[PDB]
Each structure stands twice: as structure tokens, then as C-alpha cells.
Design a protein around this ligand. Structure first.
Ligand SMILES: *CC(=O)c1ccc(Br)cc1
Ligand SMILES: *CC(=O)c1ccc(Br)cc1
Lengths: 121, 121
């Protein structure tokens, strides 16, 4: 769920997830995708594409188990959808961390209506 | 959709919707409801309760027509769900404006996991 995702983002990036990523660029936050503004945004694009594989679980609402081991996100439960979900979330958290170097506050509450239409995943 | 909702919030409050309300308190923003932190939050609680009446339209994704007339949000189309949706959104925008006086930045990215469970609507 968004709870695990936010926690993962906090764990990897050390940033308040909602503040830093709740509305960033064309892909981080609500609704769907848009042409990415930058690498951080592209993380979120990839992450929304990743969500497309999920069957039977709701990426926003459904909790799943993961733990922090050796300062790594370690997805737990074998429930195929929840595990895929967990891995999507882990990946975006890692990706956002990796791209902190180009994080741009100007995209924080980027006007999503002006985003260019996303390519198919 | 969130586009119309955000626009309404901007029109009424003059605030960047994502920044001011995208994650505020226990009810403004993602997921569901929680015991409101304050009046602004309660607007959002009421607004998520309002969404519960919607059948056949997606409150996040579905566009609808409204206009700004006499500095009032005026919901257009007769499609029953979309009109209800529009009115829910109009109401929360008005409500958020009305409660700007107690808007508290401390709730902006309130830790939603610690929210108390919402009462039934
Ligand atoms: C999936 C992803 O990276 C994302 C980021 C922010 C919000 Br909000 C929702 C989803
Ligand atoms: C419904 C409502 O007031 C609300 C506010 C912020 C976000 Br984000 C979603 C919905």
C-alpha cells in the first residue's frame, strides 16, 4: 500500500515521501503517467508501469510485508501480486534515492495537466 | 477528476492544491479517511464520504464539466454520477476555502499512519 511505499521511500531517500514525491513531476503522485520531467520522475513512471502487472491486489490500499535488513528493503510474503507490488515499490524507492542528485524542487507540485501524454509502458 | 478538483480548490482557496491539500491531515490526499485533525481535514473527510455515493464514475480519473461563473463553481453536465462528483468536489473546495483561517501547515504532510480510524460516514 501507499503506507509501505511511503515507508520505503523514507527508508531509502531519508525524504518525507508525500512532500518530496507526492506530487513530483508528471509521474510521482496521483493519477497516471506523463512524459517524465527528469530521472526522479522517470522512477515514478517506471513504478506506474510496474503496477500494470498487478492482478488481484490494489497497489494503493493493500498492505504487504517487508522488512529492512542490512539497510535493504526485503519484500516478504509469497502472495504473487503483493510480492510484485512490494518489488515495484522497492524499486521506485531505490530509484528515487539513486536520483536524489537531480531532484528538482521546481517539479514538486508540477502542474500535471500540462504533462505530455505518456507513451505506452 | 483530480484535475477538476484541484482546479476548484485553486479557484476557491487561491492555494496550490497539491501543496496545501495533497497530504493534509488524515483526510486530504491519498487513501481513505481518518479522524479529522481540524476543520480543513474535516472538509476532506466529508468530501471522501461524499464520494461514497458515486456509482459508475471514478472520482479520481473521470473528467466532468464545470465552469466558474460569478466567482462560483457551477457544475455542468447532467450525467448523474459526474454531477454528484462535481458537487462533492465543489463542496470540498468551498469548505477548504471557508476553513483557511485554521489551516495549519503542521498537518500538511501529517503522518497518516498514525491517524485514528475514521467513523463510518
Ligand atoms: C508509484 C510512485 O512512485 C508514486 C509516487 C508518489 C505517489 Br503519490 C504515488 C505513486
Ligand atoms: C477529496 C479531497 O478533499 C481530497 C483532497 C486531497 C487529495 Br490528494 C485527494 C482528495
Amino acid at each position: 500500500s501507499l503506507f509501505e511505499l511511503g515507508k520505503m521511500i523514507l527508508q531509502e531517500t531519508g525524504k518525507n515521501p508525500a512532500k518530496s514525491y507526492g506530487a513530483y513531476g508528471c509521474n510521482c503522485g496521483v493519477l497516471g503517467r506523463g512524459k517524465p520531467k527528469d530521472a526522479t520522475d522517470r522512477c515514478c513512471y517506471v513504478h506506474k508501469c510496474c503496477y500494470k502487472k498487478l492482478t488481484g491486489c490494489d497497489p494503493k490500499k493493500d498492505r504487504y510485508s517487508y522488512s529492512w535488513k542490512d539497510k535493504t528493503i526485503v519484500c516478504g510474503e509469497n502472495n504473487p501480486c503483493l510480492k510484485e507490488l512490494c518489488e515495484c515499490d522497492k524499486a521506485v524507492a531505490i530509484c528515487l534515492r539513486e536520483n536524489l542528485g537531480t531532484y528538482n524542487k521546481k517539479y514538486r507540485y508540477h502542474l500535471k495537466p500540462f504533462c505530455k501524454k505518456a507513451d505506452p509502458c
